[PDB]
Amino acid sequence: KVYNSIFDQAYEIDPIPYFNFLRKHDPVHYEESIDAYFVSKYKDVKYILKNNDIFNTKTLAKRAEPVMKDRVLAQMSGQEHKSKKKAILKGMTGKYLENLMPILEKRTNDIINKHIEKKEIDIVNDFGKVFAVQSSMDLLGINLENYEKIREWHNGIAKFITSFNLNDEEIKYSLECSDKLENYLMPLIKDRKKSTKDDLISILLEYKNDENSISDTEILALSLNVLLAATEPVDKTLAYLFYNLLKNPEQFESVKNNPKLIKNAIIETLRYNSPVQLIPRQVSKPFIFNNTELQAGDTVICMIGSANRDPEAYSNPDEFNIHRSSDTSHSQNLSFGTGVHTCVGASFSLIQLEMVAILLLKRLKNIKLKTMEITEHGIYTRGPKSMVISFD
Numbered sequence: 597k598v599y600n601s602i603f604d605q606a607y608e609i610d611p612i613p614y615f616n617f618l619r620k621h622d623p624v625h626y627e628e629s630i631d632a633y634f635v636s637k638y639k640d641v642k643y644i645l646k647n648n649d650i651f652n653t654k655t656l657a658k659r660a661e662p663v664m665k666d667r668v669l670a671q672m673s674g675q676e677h678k679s680k681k682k683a684i685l686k687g688m689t690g691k692y693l694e695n696l697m698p699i700l701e702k703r704t705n706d707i708i709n710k711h712i713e714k715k716e717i718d719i720v721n722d723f724g725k726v727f728a729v730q731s732s733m734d735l736l737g738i739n740l741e742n743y744e745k746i747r748e749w750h751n752g753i754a755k756f757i758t759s760f761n762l763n764d765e766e767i768k769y770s771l772e773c774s775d776k777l778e779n780y781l782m783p784l785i786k787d788r789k790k791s792t793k794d795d796l797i798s799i800l801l802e803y804k805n806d807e808n809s810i811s812d813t814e815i816l817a818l819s820l821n822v823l824l825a826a827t828e829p830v831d832k833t834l835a836y837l838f839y840n841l842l843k844n845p846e847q848f849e850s851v852k853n854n855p856k857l858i859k860n861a862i863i864e865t866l867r868y869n870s871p872v873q874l875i876p877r878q879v880s881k882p883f884i885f886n887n888t889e890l891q892a893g894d895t896v897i898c899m900i901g902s903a904n905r906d907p908e909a910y911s912n913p914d915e916f917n918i919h920r921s922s923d924t925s926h927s928q929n930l931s932f933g934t935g936v937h938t939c940v941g942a943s944f945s946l947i948q949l950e951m952v953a954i955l956l957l958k959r960l961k962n963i964k965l966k967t968m969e970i971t972e973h974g975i976y977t978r979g980p981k982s983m984v985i986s987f988d
């Protein structure tokens with residue numbers, strides 16, 4: 597019946613031809629392996645994400661507590677979701693952001709100083725993976741002495757959230773990582789409950805729902821939520837950013853001449869190489885897109901990368917171009933989602949990524965690409981295996 601499958605080996609190598617096929621010939625495409633429909637068009641993805649009543653977040657909550665231990669932001673709605681989401685945003689805004697940024701500069705320069713004498717650096721494996729988890733740890737308030745293990749346990753935890761058909765051995769490891777993470781963080785939450793600091797964990801401890809505070813296991817669940825949410829996409833976007841710029845020397849030069857263009861470059865990178873590729877939702881009642889019928893309980897998976905390359909939303913969608921003027925040839929990209937559950941860390945991510953990119957451009961002179969062709973891996977979250985640059 598249908599022979600093009602998201603789970604073909606060719607898809608993870610290069611999904612762009614699949615994007616083009618699905619939008620034209622099967623915009624709501626059923627995959628029997630996971631009993632879910634994949635949605636490829638910008639307009640349908642946007643409709644799904646903007647109608648939380650019809651397409652809810654019960655899918656995410658399921659295979660998540662096994663590793664989260666309690667309820668995460670996605671499983672919340674109404675005034676609870678708004679209030680707790682505002683609490684988390686408090687940890688990356690106001691005075692917390694003023695204090696956090698100089699620390700992230702320190703993290704960045706410490707990594708640069710570690711590699712500068714070698715005259716090359718892997719933006720993925722030398723910088724991205726290390727900075728991403730340390731930034732998240734600074735945001736939360738976890739001291740960096742054990743960032744090595746924190747990263748290890750995060751990866752096993754993320755693998756569970758971002759995988760579809762994990763075997764019994766893989767499931768048990770991800771669960772062990774979740775327990776090790778919980779063993780490390782509970783004492784920390786106990787300490788900060790006694791002596792508060794200026795970090796996200798302390799914020800969660802001080803939050804007040806009338807006169808009831810978030811229990812210690814829900815603070816950990818939300819802490820793990822933030823650790824996972826903030827770490828994974830940073831590595832990939834940084835690597836994609838410098839790759840696309842170096843693959844387009846002209847645009848790389850424009851960013852050097854007008855450093856203000858770096859924000860536009862990050863946004864175009866998030867559209868072009870969307871690091872979060874899939875957003876699942878659960879259908880709450882009968883519904884039809886084109887002539888594909890959905891039933892209550894069905895699962896739809898928004899294809900963020902496909903939607904951001906939809907020719908109905910962007911002209912020349914498959915070309916990297918930082919000069920895209922929003923003034924249909926341009927639309928707001930879906931890299932941070934949209935609607936009720938849009939990424940709480942969107943503004944922070946843009947600020948943090950611009951900080952890092954500017955510093956890399958300032959300290960690394962005459963950057964030259966060494967990884968002339970990247971190999972990308974992952975279908976749920978996606979990024980290059982390696983992205984090496986050389987410099988003076």
Ligand code: HEM
Pocket residue numbers: 669670681684821822825826827829830833866871872875876930931932933934936937938939940941942944945
């Ligand atoms: C380039 C970096 C990032 C990208 C591309 C990204 C992407 C996304 C996307 C697409 C969603 C929507 C998920 C859904 O609708 O089910 C989301 C949600 C979320 N993100 Fe991010 N994110 C990034 C960075 C961060 C950071 C730094 C944080 C720090 C806390 C964060 C925390 C969250 C949270 C808590 C949610 C859940 C929002 C809710 O349920 O209301 N993300 N993110």
Ligand SMILES: NCc1c[nH]c2ccccc12
Pocket residue numbers: 754757758824825826828829872939977
């Ligand atoms: N906040 C980014 C984000 C959205 N969905 C995810 C799934 C796994 C890891 C990170 C993410």
